[PDB]
Amino acid sequence: MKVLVINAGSSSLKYQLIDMTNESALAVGLCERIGIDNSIITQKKFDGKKLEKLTDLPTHKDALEEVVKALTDDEFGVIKDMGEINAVGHRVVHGGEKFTTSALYDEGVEKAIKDCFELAPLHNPPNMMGISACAEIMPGTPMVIVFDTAFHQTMPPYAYMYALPYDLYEKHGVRKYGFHGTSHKYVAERAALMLGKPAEETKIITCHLGNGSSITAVEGGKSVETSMGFTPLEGLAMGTRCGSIDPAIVPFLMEKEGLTTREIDTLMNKKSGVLGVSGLSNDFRDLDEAASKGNRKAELALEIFAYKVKKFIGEYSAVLNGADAVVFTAGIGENSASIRKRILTGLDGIGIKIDDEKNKIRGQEIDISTPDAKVRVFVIPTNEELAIARETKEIVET
Amino acid sequence: MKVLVINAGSSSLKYQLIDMTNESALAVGLCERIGIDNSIITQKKFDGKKLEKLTDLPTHKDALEEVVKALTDDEFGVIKDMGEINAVGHRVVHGGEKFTTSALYDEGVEKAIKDCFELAPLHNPPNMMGISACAEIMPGTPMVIVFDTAFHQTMPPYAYMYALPYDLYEKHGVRKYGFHGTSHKYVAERAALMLGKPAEETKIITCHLGNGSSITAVEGGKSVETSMGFTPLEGLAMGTRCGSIDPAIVPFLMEKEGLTTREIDTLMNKKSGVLGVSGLSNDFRDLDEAASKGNRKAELALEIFAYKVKKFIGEYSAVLNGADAVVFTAGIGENSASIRKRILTGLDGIGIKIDDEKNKIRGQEIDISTPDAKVRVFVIPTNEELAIARETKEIVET
Ligand SMILES: Nc1ncnc2c1ncn2[C@@H]1O[C@H](COP(=O)(O)OP(=O)(O)O)[C@@H](O)[C@H]1O
Numbered sequence: 077m078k079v080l081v082i083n084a085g086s087s088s089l090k091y092q093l094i095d096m097t098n099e100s101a102l103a104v105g106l107c108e109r110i111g112i113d114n115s116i117i118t119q120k121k122f123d124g125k126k127l128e129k130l131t132d133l134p135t136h137k138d139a140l141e142e143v144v145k146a147l148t149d150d151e152f153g154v155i156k157d158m159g160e161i162n163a164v165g166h167r168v169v170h171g172g173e174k175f176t177t178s179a180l181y182d183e184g185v186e187k188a189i190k191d192c193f194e195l196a197p198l199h200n201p202p203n204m205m206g207i208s209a210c211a212e213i214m215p216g217t218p219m220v221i222v223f224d225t226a227f228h229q230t231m232p233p234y235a236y237m238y239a240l241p242y243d244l245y246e247k248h249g250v251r252k253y254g255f256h257g258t259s260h261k262y263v264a265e266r267a268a269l270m271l272g273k274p275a276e277e278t279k280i281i282t283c284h285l286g287n288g289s290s291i292t293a294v295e296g297g298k299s300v301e302t303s304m305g306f307t308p309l310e311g312l313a314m315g316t317r318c319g320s321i322d323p324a325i326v327p328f329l330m331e332k333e334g335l336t337t338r339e340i341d342t343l344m345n346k347k348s349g350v351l352g353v354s355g356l357s358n359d360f361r362d363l364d365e366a367a368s369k370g371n372r373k374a375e376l377a378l379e380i381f382a383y384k385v386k387k388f389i390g391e392y393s394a395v396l397n398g399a400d401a402v403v404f405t406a407g408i409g410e411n412s413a414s415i416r417k418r419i420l421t422g423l424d425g426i427g428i429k430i431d432d433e434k435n436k437i438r439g440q441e442i443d444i445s446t447p448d449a450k451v452r453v454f455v456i457p458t459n460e461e462l463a464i465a466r467e468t469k470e471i472v473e474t
Numbered sequence: 475m476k477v478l479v480i481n482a483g484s485s486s487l488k489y490q491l492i493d494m495t496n497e498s499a500l501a502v503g504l505c506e507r508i509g510i511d512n513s514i515i516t517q518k519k520f521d522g523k524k525l526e527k528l529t530d531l532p533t534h535k536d537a538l539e540e541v542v543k544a545l546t547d548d549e550f551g552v553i554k555d556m557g558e559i560n561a562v563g564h565r566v567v568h569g570g571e572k573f574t575t576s577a578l579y580d581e582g583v584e585k586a587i588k589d590c591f592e593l594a595p596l597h598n599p600p601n602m603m604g605i606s607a608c609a610e611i612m613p614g615t616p617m618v619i620v621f622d623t624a625f626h627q628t629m630p631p632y633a634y635m636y637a638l639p640y641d642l643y644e645k646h647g648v649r650k651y652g653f654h655g656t657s658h659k660y661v662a663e664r665a666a667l668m669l670g671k672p673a674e675e676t677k678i679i680t681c682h683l684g685n686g687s688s689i690t691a692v693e694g695g696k697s698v699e700t701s702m703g704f705t706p707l708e709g710l711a712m713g714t715r716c717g718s719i720d721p722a723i724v725p726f727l728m729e730k731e732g733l734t735t736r737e738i739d740t741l742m743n744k745k746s747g748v749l750g751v752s753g754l755s756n757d758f759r760d761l762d763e764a765a766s767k768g769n770r771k772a773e774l775a776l777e778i779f780a781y782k783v784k785k786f787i788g789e790y791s792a793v794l795n796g797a798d799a800v801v802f803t804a805g806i807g808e809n810s811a812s813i814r815k816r817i818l819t820g821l822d823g824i825g826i827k828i829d830d831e832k833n834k835i836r837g838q839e840i841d842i843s844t845p846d847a848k849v850r851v852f853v854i855p856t857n858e859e860l861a862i863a864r865e866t867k868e869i870v871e872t
């Protein structure tokens with residue numbers, strides 16, 4: 077089965093055609109400057125052939141029509157006709173409580189998606205232009221919407237409910253949702269394979285450490301607890317987000333600094349995290365160098381960041397009653413040997429011990445723990461597009 | 475030297491008269507329903523004699539006047555006249571940045587306590603009322619203030635700093651302080667004795683579970699991390715407090731419901747916790763009974779509460795790199811075998827296993843873990859009053 081994965085932006089459209097037989101990306105592409113002048117589509121075919129075409133792309137529908145032409149090109153394409161695309165997949169952030177699994181697209185899902193957004197306190201609404209264009213160009217092809225909140229819908233009530241007045245949950249839907257679902261589910265699946273046990277028999281803690289960061293406790297293949305909550309702000313300190321602070325600090329700051337609700341929200345989401353502490357950057361690479369060159373604020377920001385991840389590993393070890401493995405993924409998790417070191421030092425007491433040399437390897441699924449450690453520590457690159465395609469294939473199959 | 479220890483709440487006042495010659499509690503008492511109807515003072519003398527008086531107590535000053543009359547009663551009292559009270563030690567929750575060690579009461583201490591009213595809204599006002607009541611009733615007696623925050627001053631910067639813009643820490647003193655210090659320090663000491671090791675060699679997790687609840691990670695006798703923060707609101711779900719929720723919920727609620735900063739603070743401190751979830755009570759005894767009789771909201775509130783304590787045990791196990799013991803104290807911690815059961819179930823994976831029969835014993839320092847468990851679980855009655863009296867003696871003596 078071949079799956080086309082679409083990711084649409086205001087004036088762009090990224091795509092990948094993936095063969096699910098071998099999970100190989102046959103072609104990867106990008107349409108830019110849509111609705112602008114000098115539109116362009118660029119496609120890379122697996123064997124090192126690149127196609128570029130300067131043509132006008134007024135709307136996402138035009139871009140998608142070109143994408144199909146580029147995929148079927150005699151020499152630079154990978155399929156003979158549009159009919160070889162068995163399904164299309166798209167990722168949306170919030171599915172609230174309406175979406176407990178990925179969904180087959182139709183007029184119903186389009187409305188539910190819009191509602192989930194207007195009820196949620198999220199910033200950027202979902203971009204539907206890619207999804208819409210798809211319905212016109214390929215009416216007969218199954219389309220699957222994948223939600224980042226979906227994977228966490230298996231959480232029990234004592235985990236997702238906040239200790240707030242119950243009516244707020246009922247009147248405004250306030251509860252923990254969780255994000256990065258697609259990433260957590262994918263690496264949890266890879267980790268089970270590396271443990272050599274069927275997923276149902278595994279207990280895994282997954283750490284998606286990127287500009288946004290979240291940890292999930294995966295029991296027997298299902299999410300049972302996660303660090304982000306009602307919004308992506310809860311939990312860990314991140315690039316520009318403060319994470320879980322004393323809630324009383326909010327009105328205190330609003331009275332002291334004379335701030336509006338929008339200002340305090342912006343302060344917590346964009347001026348906090350390691351950026352806010354370091355006074356320097358929200359980029360962990362920059363902080364790491366700065367810290368070595370002796371920059372104290374940068375050193376403090378990385379200490380706070382690693383310390384909080386360490387604590388969550390302890391927290392989810394209790395949730396899971398002993399974990400079989402801890403997984404690191406995303407930008408920081410996959411690439412930073414030093415940040416992994418800061419996080420994993422001082423945990424032998426709970427069965428975690430790593431090998432400094434194995435921890436230096438990069439871009440690979442690898443167990444970096446000593447062979448005698450009770451808890452395995454795996455570094456597993458997350459692959460967004462492939463995860464979305466697997467989700468799409470599962471739905472289109474069943 | 476005889477020290478009177480006072481702990482004042484909104485409508486109550488606990489006291490103990492302790493002889494420092496041998497550290498014996500001569501009399502223990504409680505004034506309840508102050509400022510309400512059917513006020514009552516109850517006193518227990520060391521020889522078992524109990525006094526109860528139904529009288530009207532309009533203000534803390536009236537209650538304190540009765541306390542003195544009960545302490546001097548010919549048969550049920552323990553001293554001949556007020557002059558036998560050499561000093562008074564007061565429990566005060568927040569002293570802010572300026573006061574983080576015990577202090578002889580003076581104009582400056584008073585100022586700091588009133589300035590922190592907004593930082594400990596449920597506590598500082600009543601603590602102040604008890605101090606003023608004491609100044610009027612016994613003008614000539616030395617008064618010593620002992621802060622809930624002192625014990626946590628050993629926390630490292632990466633634990634007490636929030637991932638917020640650094641200037642807020644500098645300009646407004648925003649950082650984690652922690653509370654119940656006196657209780658945590660005392661039971662940590664008792665736990666080291668029970669482990670038969672020098673405090674310096676121990677790693678203990680102390681859980682003070684009462685109307686207010688907090689956990690502390692004690693390493694070698696020093697507090698290294700604790701659950702409450704800038705204010706007593708952070709951390710666990712409590713009787714009427716929500717604990718650590720997604721901070722984004724604050725601005726969100728303010729906008730949806732049109733709430734000012736004062737109202738949202740009251741909502742989080744007075745209408746949340748198990749009271750907010752259950753819709754029934756903030757008393758764990760009542761919830762336990764209601765849960766057993768089939769009340770779902772009450773059952774959910776206790777699950778959320780126990781689950782959060784369980785997670786903190788995991789969190790601090792990582793902080794401490796393996797703990798030697800977990801300690802339960804305060805109202806719920808000392809008396810609820812069933813709540814301890816909910817909390818401690820499913821942790822054998824991290825070395826914690828308890829004996830259901832031992833867990834039924836009450837009012838005793840006892841190890842309730844199975845003999846083979848790697849981590850000991852002790853139930854230890856707290857004695858904040860003897861600890862406050864020790865400080866009072868030291869300060870008044872020098
Ligand atoms: N080698 C590295 N060392 C430290 N940090 C890195 C490294 N590589 C990437 N990062 C960090 O990872 C983040 C980008 O990762 P990414 O997975 O794309 O984030 P997100 O999941 O939030 O979209 C940035 O904050 C960046 O500084």
Ligand SMILES: Nc1ncnc2c1ncn2[C@@H]1O[C@H](COP(=O)(O)OP(=O)(O)O)[C@@H](O)[C@H]1O
Binds near residue numbers: 756809
């Ligand atoms: N046997 C019990 N079972 C469950 N909860 C209890 C029990 N005894 C006391 N509690 C709870 O403990 C809390 C008492 O709070 P605390 O701060 O320790 O003060 P106090 O020592 O004055 O009772 C109350 O919420 C109360 O309902």
